[PDB]
């Protein structure tokens, strides 16, 4: 449910970044993968090799960005409660008073509705693929990384 990537430096200190990522290999195939004669006529074709070695092809990676989560906000009678749960959360509301910021503590917005507010968890420790199905990081322009891909 969470992806962790780390390493060890020269000063013997280990740093690791953790990102919430739902990992469950799903169905992915376009055939039955089965020959085919052992000996026959030789013809030119193309296939994806099984070499894991970091060469040729590459994908774009970036910060998760601020991962949106609607479960962070809760309607406390006539006010909105933002339950942090030991995470850095970026909030924004339509209502008056405090309507922006980066909170580390539990916050409450007086006289507001859940639909009039937006909250997201800020991870900046881990890397994530530049996916069109995931939103772009708000406090970031075109800052991105790249990793070599197998097959």
């Amino acid at each position, epitope marked *: 449910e969470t992806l962790t990537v780390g390493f060890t430096d020269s000063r013997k200190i280990s740093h690791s970044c953790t990102h919430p990522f739902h990992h469950d290999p799903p169905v992915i195939g376009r055939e039955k993968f089965h020959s085919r004669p052992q000996h026959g006529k030789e013809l030119p074709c193309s296939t994806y090799v099984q070499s894991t070695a970091a060469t040729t092809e590459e994908i774009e990676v970036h910060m998760p960005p601020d991962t949106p989560d609607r479960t962070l906000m*809760s309607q406390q009678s006539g006010n909105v409660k933002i339950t942090v749960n030991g995470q850095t959360v970026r*909030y924004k509301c339509n209502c008056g008073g405090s309507n922006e910021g980066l909170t580390t503590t539990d916050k409450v917005i*007086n*006289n507001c509705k859940v639909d009039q507010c937006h909250a997201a968890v800020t991870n900046h420790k881990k890397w994530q693929y530049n996916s069109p199905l995931v939103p772009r990081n708000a406090e970031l322009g075109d800052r991105k990384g790249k990793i070599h891909i197998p097959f």
Partner: antibody, heavy 117, light 110 residues
Framework: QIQLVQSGREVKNPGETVKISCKAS????????MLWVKQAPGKGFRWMGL????????TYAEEFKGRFVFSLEISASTAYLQINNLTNEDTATYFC??????????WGQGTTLTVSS | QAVVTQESALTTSPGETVTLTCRSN?????????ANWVQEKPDHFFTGLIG???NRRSGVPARFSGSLIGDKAALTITGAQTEDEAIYFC?????????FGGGTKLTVLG
């Protein structure tokens, strides 16, 4: 359903310590933390802090960081307020309260302390 | 480091509609202040009415509703009753602590 019943009222001469209990009934202790409020004779209502009845971490209001110490007999659904080195101007009533629904929903009966030689 | 202000006393008659307000010294009250309304009846008897601006505690009559009116949190008693004569306190959340208002003494004919 929910009853927070508090200890009875004490008298204590300056310098002493007091442990005020709050015995909770009707809810699962663990999913709702406790607010401790001071309603001072004249002055009105004041938040003293909140205790995470799950982890056990207390928050103190800055006015209360120091002589005040929140703790809990988890096991018996009790939260407790302890005021050490009692000052004479601590006479007042202290309420325990349940934090829920983006505010406080139930208040206790109050335990009144009269600091007096 | 914020000061919640409430009307001092309000007098109404049974059957009327009365509004109590809760003002914050720092700015407009918003839904992230999670306005709470608490009632104190004689004998140091406290009950919570509304939380998170407009959530009515369970078993609190419907004549009670909360909302934000302008830049402040408000409690409206629709069809005030004789039984509603008490002190109403508002509480506002400020990112890390709660600040209580001075309370409004409400008097209802009956």
């Amino acid at each position: 359903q929910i009853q927070l019943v508090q200890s009875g009222r004490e008298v204590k001469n300056p310098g002493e310590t007091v442990k005020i209990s709050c015995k909770a009934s009707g809810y699962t202790f663990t999913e709702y933390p406790m607010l401790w409020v001071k309603q001072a004779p004249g002055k009105g209502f004041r938040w003293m802090g909140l205790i995470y009845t799950n982890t056990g971490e207390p928050t103190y209001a800055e006015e209360f960081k120091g002589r005040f110490v929140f703790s809990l007999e988890i096991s018996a659904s009790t939260a407790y307020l302890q005021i050490n080195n009692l000052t004479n101007e601590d006479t007042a009533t202290y309420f325990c309260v349940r934090d829920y629904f983006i505010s406080l929903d139930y208040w206790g009966q109050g335990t009144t302390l009269t600091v007096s030689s | 480091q914020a000061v919640v202000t409430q009307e001092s006393a309000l007098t109404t008659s049974p059957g009327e509609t009365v509004t109590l307000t809760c003002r914050s010294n720092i700015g407009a009250v918003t839904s992230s202040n999670c306005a709470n309304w608490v009632q104190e009846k004689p004998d140091h008897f406290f009950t919570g009415l509304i939380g998170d601006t407009n959530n009515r505690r369970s078993g609190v009559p419907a004549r009670f509703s909360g909302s934000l009116i302008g830049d402040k949190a408000a409690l409206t008693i629709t069809g005030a009753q004789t039984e509603d004569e008490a002190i109403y306190f508002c509480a506002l959340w400020y990112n890390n602590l709660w600040v209580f208002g001075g309370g409004t003494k409400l008097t209802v004919l009956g």
